[PDB]
């Protein structure tokens, strides 16, 4: 059954709750972003109102074939009325089209649901600065102090320098980037840009990118693999077997592959810096795991929450075990006692 952490009290609303069939009493289903664990269950046969960003709406239409009449896109940073309740969508700094949702309850309670987010100090100057938030439904993916990672900017700088050096030393080297969802487009676009290439990909993935309102996107991507020296492949194919295989397919246009696997966290984050990363190498093939995160580090999360000073926190990630639940509740209490709310 639909868990309580997916229901907004005092409304008929649910958030990211598309795989339970009809939810008794739901008059509007919100979708924070187009990632499969969140949209799971949506299809062309859905006949309830879906409220979401413009970009998420383009993906629902073109990739899922949900019918236009059930898609209600809203602009960001704008007070909107939905079934008699004032809401605002904010940028979540996750993947394209990902939002946080502010609900203003008839009784005066204000609720923020983060969806998936990477907290950033820039959020402290959005519409959230303007009033008190009583309840926070929080993306707790990396709610533990071992989770440190570098900035996105540092990680992209590393990837750009690595690629540029490799290809300048060997003009017959191929760069490959893995993907399995939207998100992390900066990795492959930043590399393609320093190499004066467009990025080449399958027709399904090109279609997905054409939904995302990226400016000048026609200048940056293509379905013609052979004209491009940055290829995207399914993340499953980023290993020696899948890469050697792939290399054959270019017909000896290339003699070397340099591949990036943008992971979330991996335990080498607890010992090594970005400047000190190394690849796995078998032959003319090298694979870099780079820690490009679209979720809050523990410190970014803690800062956000200590700024917001909510009355109650409802975790939406890692809620399945008593040990995780208990650990998270300890961190929330530390934060509250340190900051004095
Ligand atoms: Ni996500």
UniProtKB/Swiss-Prot annotation:
Protein name as it appears in the record: DNA cross-link repair 1A protein
Taxonomic superkingdom: Eukaryota
GO biological process entries: cell division; double-strand break repair via nonhomologous end joining; interstrand cross-link repair
Role noted for this protein: May be required for DNA interstrand cross-link repair. Also required for checkpoint mediated cell cycle arrest in early prophase in response to mitotic spindle poisons. Possesses beta-lactamase activity, catalyzing the hydrolysis of penicillin G and nitrocefin. Exhibits no activity towards other beta-lactam antibiotic classes including cephalosporins (cefotaxime) and carbapenems (imipenem).
UniProt family annotation: Belongs to the DNA repair metallo-beta-lactamase (DRMBL) family.
Known outcome of mutating residue 295 to A: Impaired nuclear focus formation, reduced interaction with PIAS and increased sensitivity to cisplatin
Compartment(s) where it occurs, according to its Swiss-Prot or TrEMBL record: Nucleus
Tissue expression: Expressed in brain, heart, kidney, liver, pancreas, placenta and skeletal muscle.
Main subcellular localisation: nucleus
The keyword Nucleus is assigned to this record: yes
Subunit structure: Binds constitutively to TP53BP1. Binds CDC27, which is itself a component of the anaphase promoting complex (APC). Binds PIAS1.
